[PDB]
């Protein structure tokens, strides 16, 4: 157990493996950002019934079936971690999914801000298009269905039946609009590689402490 | 006293240190069922002002008894939950009581209440799939029946009154969430590990003691 | 010495407790029902409730209605939890009060009520009649309130017949006791041995 | 390995500092303005949109359109660190523009504080009143997307005589609606031209550079002790 095999099997080989894996097998992953707020025409259950509603399974199943999100997430076959691989289970793609938009909300305004990641910046712009489009078609669609039921002299509450199921109640205003972005953010290979650093030379300084303090006996 | 020599450091080991993932490797391999999991998210909202309360109603009347009776009229638990033959521990035996019934039966359906804006989640535990989703279908439906029956008794006494909101409607798992095998099995490797850790320094000092 | 206290203390005890859960003991059914009131067109009302079904009045209407005092004394093997014939009315509402166990949850407003018997069909006999007559002095406080159905009462879970005697828990009550036994003998022989 | 080791984490950084600060920087000119908007005839919320907006990237694209900052902030050479470089990324830029203008919001009354920097007191003035400009638009904006779709509606509805009552009503009410200033933003305090630089502090940072090389001589003296015991 000496130095150097304490030092080639803590520090210089995890080093190794993250520098072959970040410079020369990671896929880079594009972010595009958005804020949004919903409102009524002249708020936090709506907020939280979007907050659900996004990380949602009937939201993927409808994603899924527009804009080909399987495989989409397929398609880097250089990075095994983040790719998403075929044949996977449903519940497998759904964490995935959760993994990849990220939805953050400030209590103070009632903000959503949603971040959704995707391996090529157009296609995360159309893919937080599409969750801010059907968001809105499903904030709407469940005051229409709640006021038709509701509704459905007697004339007078017919008509107001009807106008109420037809009157867009509800509405989304974006605050900052989906964005297109330049270059990828995700993964910070320097950073990440930095940190590493400094984590296995503590990790073999505390090692290497405890060898030589178990050593010291020598009876 | 005469026993505590007995335990010598190889024996307390194969007594809970190895026995226990001995059967532990038998049942969740070899004997264990599968257990599809179908979630569903919902709240009740105040269409029948012409409103956490009426969630925490419905929380109640899911584990409620009358309900069990109803969805064991409408879709035969009993002898669904008798499927399995392989798993004792998840599978209901015949003959058993009504009580026992009713434990079992708030054991797989859970329930919880997201508390920070008040969302109920319905979690549903069945052999099948497809089961597990028309479960969760007749315990909304039945959900709805009972939140608009709740007005429509007031307002005879003296329309859909009330109304069930579904965020996320019941859905059709693929694989089986629970039993998780190999998380139980780390688990139960670490918790074996430290009693033996700590009852081999109790039987030293006991023994060094006496 | 210290075989006394070995066994006198914790030994006793034990052999009493198996003599009576085992063949002395008698079974208890139960059942339950979570009900709100709440009014047709609200926690004072509940409260009310809560007063109310722990009284003396209602006990009186309920012994005339169904005769708990000849119920309540059927079972002579069990010594303890029967009643015994010709007490005083105050141990009657002690007992009373025992049988019928009432839980509030203020987190919404919600009522529960687990009545015990010796019969599954007069547990629910009675958990219903008591339903019905809180109802009939919930509208009876406002009829007499507005004389010089104003409310209602709300079933979420009705009267359920139970199948199995849920009550006592005999195991549970052995090991409980074994432990607090084992307890009490280690802190008095712990005294006992550092006096010296 | 005992006396060169401090001529390396402190006086060496030290100098590679002032000789930057006081012969390479270049000042940088601020420009303030203090905002509130108002309902017209809590308003918090709004000041809070705003306080979104005006970090935001679509409000930074029409910026650059109009103004054009991308090679006002290359101009000066002098700056390696300080200056925008030539084919930088477009986040970066997002970053660059979010760390020149400062936003602070006082919320026992709800203001305000927009703090631009510049290299021109004109330039910070003018992109000052660009936000100004620009918000006041916005809240209007957004105030009236909310209003088209029910005017949208009502020329649906459009499409016995009491019924063509309510739909000119309410045509109409959405037409009024659409077309008037909603939302107003006053202004307390309007941009400033300033006449010298505030924000290139020179002194201060040498103090926390000073207190940084010390603790890392400090501690890089401690593990260099620690190995030569070893």
Redesign the interface.
């Known amino acids: 157990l000496t130095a150097k095999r304490l030092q080639w099997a803590l520090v210089y080989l995890p080093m190794l493996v993250a520098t072959v894996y970040f410079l020369v097998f990671s896929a880079d992953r594009y972010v595009s950002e958005s804020?949004i707020?919903v409102?009524q025409?002249?708020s936090?259950?709506d907020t939280?019934?979007l907050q659900?509603?996004i990380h949602?399974?009937?939201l993927l199943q409808k994603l899924d079936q527009q804009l080909k999100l399987r495989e989409h997430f397929g398609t880097p076959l250089r990075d095994p971690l983040f790719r998403l691989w075929g044949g996977t289970?449903?519940?497998w793609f759904l964490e995935y999914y959760r993994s990849r938009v990220e939805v953050l909300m400030d209590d103070?305004?009632?903000?959503l801000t949603v971040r959704v990641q995707g391996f090529e910046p157009e296609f995360a712009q159309a893919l937080n298009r599409a969750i801010l489009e059907e968001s809105e078609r499903f904030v709407n669609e469940?005051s229409h269905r709640?006021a038709r039921?509701?509704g459905?002299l007697a004339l007078a509450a017919v008509?107001s039946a009807r106008?109420e199921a037809?009157?867009?109640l509800k509405?989304l205003?974006v605050?900052?609009?989906p964005?297109l972005?330049?270059?990828a953010?995700y993964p910070r290979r320097w950073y990440n590689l930095a940190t590493l650093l400094v984590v296995c030379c503590l990790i073999y300084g505390v090692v290497s402490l405890v060898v030589?303090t178990i050593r010291d006996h020598q009876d």
């Open positions: 804020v707020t409102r025409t002249s936090r259950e939280c019934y659900t509603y949602s399974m009937g289970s449903q519940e103070i305004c009632g903000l469940l709640m039921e509701q459905q008509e106008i037809t009157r867009k509405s205003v605050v900052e609009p964005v972005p330049e270059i953010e030589a």
